Amino acid sequence: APQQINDIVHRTITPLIEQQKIPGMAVAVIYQGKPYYFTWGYADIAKKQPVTQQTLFELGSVSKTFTGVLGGDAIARGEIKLSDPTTKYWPELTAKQWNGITLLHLATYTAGGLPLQVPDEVKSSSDLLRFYQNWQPAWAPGTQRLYANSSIGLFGALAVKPSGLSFEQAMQTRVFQPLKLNHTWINVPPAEEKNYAWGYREGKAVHVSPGALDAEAYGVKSTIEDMARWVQSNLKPLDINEKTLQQGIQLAQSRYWQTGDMYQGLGWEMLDWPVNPDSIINGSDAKIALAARPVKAITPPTPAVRASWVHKTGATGGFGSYVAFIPEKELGIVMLANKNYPNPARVDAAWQILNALQ
Ligand SMILES: *[B]([O])([O])[C]([N]C(=O)[C]C1=[C][C]=[C]S1)C1=[C][C]=[C][C]=[C]1
Numbered sequence: 386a387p388q389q390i391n392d393i394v395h396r397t398i399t400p401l402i403e404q405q406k407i408p409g410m411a412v413a414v415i416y417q418g419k420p421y422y423f424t425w426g427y428a429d430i431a432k433k434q435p436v437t438q439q440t441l442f443e444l445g446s447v448s449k450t451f452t453g454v455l456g457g458d459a460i461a462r463g464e465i466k467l468s469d470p471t472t473k474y475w476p477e478l479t480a481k482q483w484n485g486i487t488l489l490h491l492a493t494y495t496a497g498g499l500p501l502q503v504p505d506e507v508k509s510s511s512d513l514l515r516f517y518q519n520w521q522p523a524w525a526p527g528t529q530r531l532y533a534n535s536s537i538g539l540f541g542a543l544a545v546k547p548s549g550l551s552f553e554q555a556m557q558t559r560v561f562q563p564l565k566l567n568h569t570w571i572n573v574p575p576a577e578e579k580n581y582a583w584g585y586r587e588g589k590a591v592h593v594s595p596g597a598l599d600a601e602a603y604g605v606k607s608t609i610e611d612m613a614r615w616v617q618s619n620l621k622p623l624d625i626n627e628k629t630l631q632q633g634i635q636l637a638q639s640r641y642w643q644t645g646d647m648y649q650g651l652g653w654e655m656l657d658w659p660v661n662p663d664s665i666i667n668g669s670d671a672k673i674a675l676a677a678r679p680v681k682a683i684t685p686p687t688p689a690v691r692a693s694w695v696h697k698t699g700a701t702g703g704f705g706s707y708v709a710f711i712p713e714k715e716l717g718i719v720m721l722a723n724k725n726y727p728n729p730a731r732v733d734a735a736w737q738i739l740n741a742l743q
């Protein structure tokens with residue numbers, strides 16, 4: 386690999402791993418479009434299995450970028466419109482607070498304060514309808530952003546209804562297969578278990594547990610090679626041959642709302658580049674505090690801006706992931722770890738590496 390990439394990655398990541406006591410980590414840097422891979426430590430401490438380029442990590446909320454793109458692909462196919470009220474796809478949601486809440490609001494966390502998590506007690510289709518019917522918004526739609534699994538998760542489930550496919554089947558056939566993400570899974574098959582890393586929380590080996598809207602909000606597992614390909618695909622959508630998927634990727638990076646320095650896409654979040662890490666932390670869900678932020682509508686949405694820091698953080702109980710890329714520099718990074726460590730440390734490391742290579 387080019388020595389400049391080797392050096393900045395190792396000099397940045399080694400201290401990160403030591404400081405955060407991460408058991409295993411994989412990193413990919415996409416430079417001028419080509420991927421370069423790095424791995425450290427262990428996928429399974431007890432069984433002494435090393436992290437490799439084939440190790441599967443839980444992406445946590447980075448899964449929302451796949452949900453946003455799959456929804457963009459459905460818009461491009463003419464199956465749904467973001468301006469469509471939620472009730473068009475779920476007539477059974479008769480409670481009055483749903484009047485005026487559109488798919489756009491679900492996809493961008495602006496429905497009026499849907500909760501951060503779907504409760505563990507929600508286990509059936511009937512339980513989920515009850516949950517949404519009983520939810521009382523704190524705000525009118527389209528006024529404040531409150532990051533939430535229950536918002537984009539519902540968007541994902543509804544976006545695939547016209548297709549006649551399950552969410553998993555739609556993701557596989559419309560996003561994973563065309564992009565050749567052949568080791569990316571919503572459900573890890575038994576054949577792939579040998580590469581599935583364990584996550585570590587308080588020193589115990591753990592995997593994410595089943596939950597309502599898990600696939601849609603935080604349930605993808607992938608390797609560092611497939612994630613590098615996902616970044617490549619989002620950096621250069623015009624190279625994608627499937628027309629609706631190319632258009633869907635473009636729609637997911639459009640700018641729909643602004644709050645401070647951040648712009649909300651579908652799954653992806655963006656800031657104008659150049660920008661420093663402190664502003665990225667304060668202008669993203671990477672900050673430690675859970676925040677209600679008033680938003681300004683971008684009417685109409687701005688098409689994907691090349692000079693942007695486009696990114697997404699993700700976590701499960703035992704994993705911490707981060708993806709960031711800058712289209713105009715053809716530069717990106719993926720960091721996958723089997724410990725959920727502080728988001729600010731992820732941003733600091735990613736920025737140190739990309740700033741050195743831009
Ligand atoms: B995402 O922002 O990473 C999201 N992830 C999950 O809900 C998956 C988890 C299962 C157990 C712990 S995290 C997230 C939303 C809200 C709080 C933390 C992470």
Ligand SMILES: [K+]
Pocket residue numbers: 595596597598599600
């Ligand atoms: K589920």
